[PDB]
Amino acid sequence: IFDLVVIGAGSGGLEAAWNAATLYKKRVAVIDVQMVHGPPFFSALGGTCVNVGCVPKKLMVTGAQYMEHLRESAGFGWEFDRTTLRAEWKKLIAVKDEAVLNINKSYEEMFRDTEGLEFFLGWGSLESKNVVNVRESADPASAVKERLETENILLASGSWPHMPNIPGIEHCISSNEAFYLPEPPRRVLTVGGGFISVEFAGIFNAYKPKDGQVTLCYRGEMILRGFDHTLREELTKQLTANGIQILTKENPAKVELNADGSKSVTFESGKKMDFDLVMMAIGRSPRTKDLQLQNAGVMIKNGGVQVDEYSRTNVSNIYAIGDVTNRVMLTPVAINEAAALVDTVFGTNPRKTDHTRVASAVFSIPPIGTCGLIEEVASKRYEVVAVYLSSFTPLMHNISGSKYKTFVAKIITNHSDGTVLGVHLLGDNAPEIIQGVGICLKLNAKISDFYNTIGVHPTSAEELCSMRTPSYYYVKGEKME
Amino acid sequence: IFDLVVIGAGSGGLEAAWNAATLYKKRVAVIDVQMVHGPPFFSALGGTCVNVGCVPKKLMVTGAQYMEHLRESAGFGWEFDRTTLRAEWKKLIAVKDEAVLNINKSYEEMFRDTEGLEFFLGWGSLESKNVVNVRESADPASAVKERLETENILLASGSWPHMPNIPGIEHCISSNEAFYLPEPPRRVLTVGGGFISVEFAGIFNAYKPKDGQVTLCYRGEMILRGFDHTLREELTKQLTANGIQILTKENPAKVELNADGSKSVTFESGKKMDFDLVMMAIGRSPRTKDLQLQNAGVMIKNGGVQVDEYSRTNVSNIYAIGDVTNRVMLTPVAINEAAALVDTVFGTNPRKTDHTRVASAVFSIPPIGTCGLIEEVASKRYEVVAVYLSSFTPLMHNISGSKYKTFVAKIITNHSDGTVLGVHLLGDNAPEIIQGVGICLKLNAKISDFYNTIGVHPTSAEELCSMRTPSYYYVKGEKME
Ligand SMILES: Cc1cc2nc3c(=O)[nH]c(=O)nc-3n(C[C@H](O)[C@H](O)[C@H](O)COP(=O)(O)OP(=O)(O)OC[C@H]3O[C@@H](n4cnc5c(N)ncnc54)[C@H](O)[C@@H]3O)c2cc1C
Numbered sequence A, B: 001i002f003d004l005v006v007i008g009a010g011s012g013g014l015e016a017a018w019n020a021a022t023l024y025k026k027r028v029a030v031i032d033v034q035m036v037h038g039p040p041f042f043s044a045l046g047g048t049c050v051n052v053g054c055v056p057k058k059l060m061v062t063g064a065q066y067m068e069h070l071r072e073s074a075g076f077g078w079e080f081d082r083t084t085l086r087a088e089w090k091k092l093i094a095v096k097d098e099a100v101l102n103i104n105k106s107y108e109e110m111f112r113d114t115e116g117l118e119f120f121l122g123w124g125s126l127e128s129k130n131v132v133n134v135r136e137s138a139d140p141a142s143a144v145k146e147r148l149e150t151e152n153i154l155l156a157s158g159s160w161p162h163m164p165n166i167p168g169i170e171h172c173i174s175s176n177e178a179f180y181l182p183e184p185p186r187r188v189l190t191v192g193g194g195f196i197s198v199e200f201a202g203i204f205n206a207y208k209p210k211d212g213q214v215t216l217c218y219r220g221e222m223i224l225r226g227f228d229h230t231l232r233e234e235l236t237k238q239l240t241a242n243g244i245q246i247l248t249k250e251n252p253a254k255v256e257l258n259a260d261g262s263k264s265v266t267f268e269s270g271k272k273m274d275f276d277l278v279m280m281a282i283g284r285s286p287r288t289k290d291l292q293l294q295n296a297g298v299m300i301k302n303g304g305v306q307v308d309e310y311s312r313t314n315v316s317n318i319y320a321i322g323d324v325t326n327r328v329m330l331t332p333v334a335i336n337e338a339a340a341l342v343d344t345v346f347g348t349n350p351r352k353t354d355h356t357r358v359a360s361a362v363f364s365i366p367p368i369g370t371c372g373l374i375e376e377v378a379s380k381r382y383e384v385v386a387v388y389l390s391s392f393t394p395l396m397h398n399i400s401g402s403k404y405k406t407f408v409a410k411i412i413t414n415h416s417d418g419t420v421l422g423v424h425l426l427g428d429n430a431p432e433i434i435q436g437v438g439i440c441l442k443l444n445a446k447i448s449d450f451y452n453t454i455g456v457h458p459t460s461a462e463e464l465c466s467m468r469t470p471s472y473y474y475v476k477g478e479k480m481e
């Protein structure tokens, strides 16, 4: 019998498990589907971030970046037989698998070296308010291979890729399978408009076969739904500048496998096109799925488990965190949600995660780092808002040759008192720069004590402390006042 | 007759000139020695930062970095005939000269397009409390070619390299001449311990001739006098890791030119060595020099002009800013000093520059970004101090091959209330990361609202918001309490 049984050894799952076991000395079962990355279930010990998420994509984006470095290197005097220069995809995913495997191996020890923490390999199902079966498959008919009795249950099952219902959806892949491709596609279509789609458009672009061609397609007007309007048009420019097709207002209607292994994707938008690989990145959805929530009587709001500020469901000894809550779908938010749950329930203080003003980044080339409100929302929340905008091609990029690489730095402000509502930047080092800006925003920085800080010269970060005067306003409507 | 005559079209000089002329509509003379970068006087319109300072070194460091990128690129699958791969120094300094020349050309227009602003080419000398001669040379005997009568004078002459008094100092160069080398030295000795020396050790290392060898020598115990102790040992490691000789407690006694053009540097430390180029980077000193300060009766404290908070001398219509004040020798501090001078004297408000908590960076490979107090000083100012330390080899650098490349992130704290006193980091992207941390420190961030901010994953910046528990203390002495 356990104090806590955590369904899913994820980012938030494994955090709450360790914090309960080690800090409050509780007895903890952690259940996960498998325990080393890759097919059939792709996620394993460590969750989605470690196996088919952040950790492998940033290695893969970092690798894709080296094609920029090898290019613009020439402008600073660096010469070599660029005829000779080719990218070895097999090596990339080979070192990736290694790195991800060890994160897996180390979590093994963590369990294999700590009281209270124990791991059951299987599929967690709710049998009651407080018994949970480690069954042998997703199908709740499959053999039970453990029933854990417990006093608390934590649902941290995460979220899965969302596939459309399309003629021939069978012939498409996901984020998950993309990480295990034997080789890079020649013609790719990443379906979807934001983040995972545009991040993977970067990676596929760099490791493609020279006569390869990448086509990001979005059924929107502009990619990255939900990001600051200027970052979206500028990234859309510099993505096409590096030669990735961006098809807006086009959506797959039917993927039919033609002949040679080719795929003919007819868009509902009339068009038909030929690809070697179609990757669906249209969404992610809570793995509410095979949890048997009704067995305990747990409520879904929509998609995933509905959960309050202190992250607990209707059922009083059950709580939920991370992606299955369908809150903010980010690893470090889920780790915080997790940390504050045990501090609340096995601890003295309650504790709730501040889901506001969370800084984040898209690792496109070049990247985006962003924090706080976008223009178009703050204008609905505040009476007069001031937008500070700064775009420039960095000198290093005039002499590098990627003049198309503009740096956008935007600061939108509640003009009525000067509190910085949101900072947004696109450009190399955007994600690193934005971290300090997240601390600022949770300190309630004014624009004044942005431009009043002495800059670090020469850096692109110093641009934030150089923005004194507004560029236009929103006095309910946009007004260069 | 002028309102203001600014001796030196520097970073601070040109800032105060423009702010007076344009904002307060004053009549302004700006005098500078020459008006395009390079020998004989190396500085020109734009000052030291533009001509023989920040702008050219960061282009040159950026170029030197590409040797890392081409190296560790191979680990992410990127292959090419690395036998073929060579660095073209001539191209580097060729594009540098271009970039720096245009900053020069644009300042020309700025004068050539603005009322009040006018530039006199020459050497500024104080004749009185308020007449200043544009003479034709440094020597005050040389022909006067203008006397400007004026109601105010601003001394912004900057600072020059400091050379030791050594047998054969004639055969050594400086920062200045290093920017104009026809070609990269094979054997180099950068004399000095910090910043310029170690930055140039980076640049020389990357563009050297493969059987070339770089030797940084410092008469100290450890390079970068004045930086956090951990950053110093770690950078000293990773500098030698990339193969630059670091000779501590060794100092040149006599540079004698031997034969073939070689130079035999005997160290006072017994040792004798052979080099192709000796660069002196032992210091910089206020260009108080040929200003004729006595003519007005202006006071030097030590080295440079002594000046109060509001940046004015004993003589009541004379003020001084930047490097000749021997305050903080940084461009953006001098631009601030400048901005606040005119706001004080041609403006309503006074205004003084906050010389505390100024973030800065050394562009070594890898770089350092730093802000606030170092451990060893705060322990003298505060009763109990907590030091938070985090060092790790980034995953990307396990798989890149530069495992030696450690990331150090240190946060030292007044433990008595938690106010962050100083943050210090070494590692790629250090300078960009530190900028947000400078704004934090001037907001008076506590350690709590560092670790209470949600991180941006995966970035090395997020490491700052992951440091909760201290590592040791100083309760007057260092105490793992
Ligand atoms: C590609 C891609 C890129 C991303 N990039 C980023 C990024 O750069 N930065 C970032 O911050 N976030 C990123 N994310 C999001 C991040 O990976 C997730 O938000 C985060 O890991 C969520 O953690 P979690 O604890 O909710 O669950 P997860 O970490 O997703 O783990 C849930 C786990 O439970 C197991 N499980 C599920 N069903 C069952 C069941 N019924 N029985 C037992 N166990 C079960 C799963 O197999 C899995 O291991 C990325 C996601 C993808 C996919």
Ligand SMILES: Cc1cc2nc3c(=O)[nH]c(=O)nc-3n(C[C@H](O)[C@H](O)[C@H](O)COP(=O)(O)OP(=O)(O)OC[C@H]3O[C@@H](n4cnc5c(N)ncnc54)[C@H](O)[C@@H]3O)c2cc1C
Pocket (backbone or CB within 6 Å): A457, A458, B007, B008, B009, B010, B011, B012, B013, B031, B032, B033, B034, B041, B043, B044, B045, B046, B047, B048, B049, B050, B052, B053, B054, B057, B122, B123, B124, B125, B156, B157, B158, B159, B175, B196, B287, B290, B291, B321, B322, B323, B324, B329, B330, B331, B332, B334
């Ligand atoms: C190599 C090297 C690297 C540096 N790197 C950095 C860096 O990365 N970041 C940073 O922030 N700072 C850097 N600095 C420091 C920075 O360059 C200076 O602090 C800053 O430019 C000082 O500005 P200033 O206004 O005092 O004068 P300056 O900009 O130095 O200009 C003074 C000017 O006056 C002219 N002048 C001098 N004597 C006379 C005279 N008697 N008559 C007329 N005119 C005269 C000079 O020729 C010169 O143009 C660097 C310095 C060097 C050298």
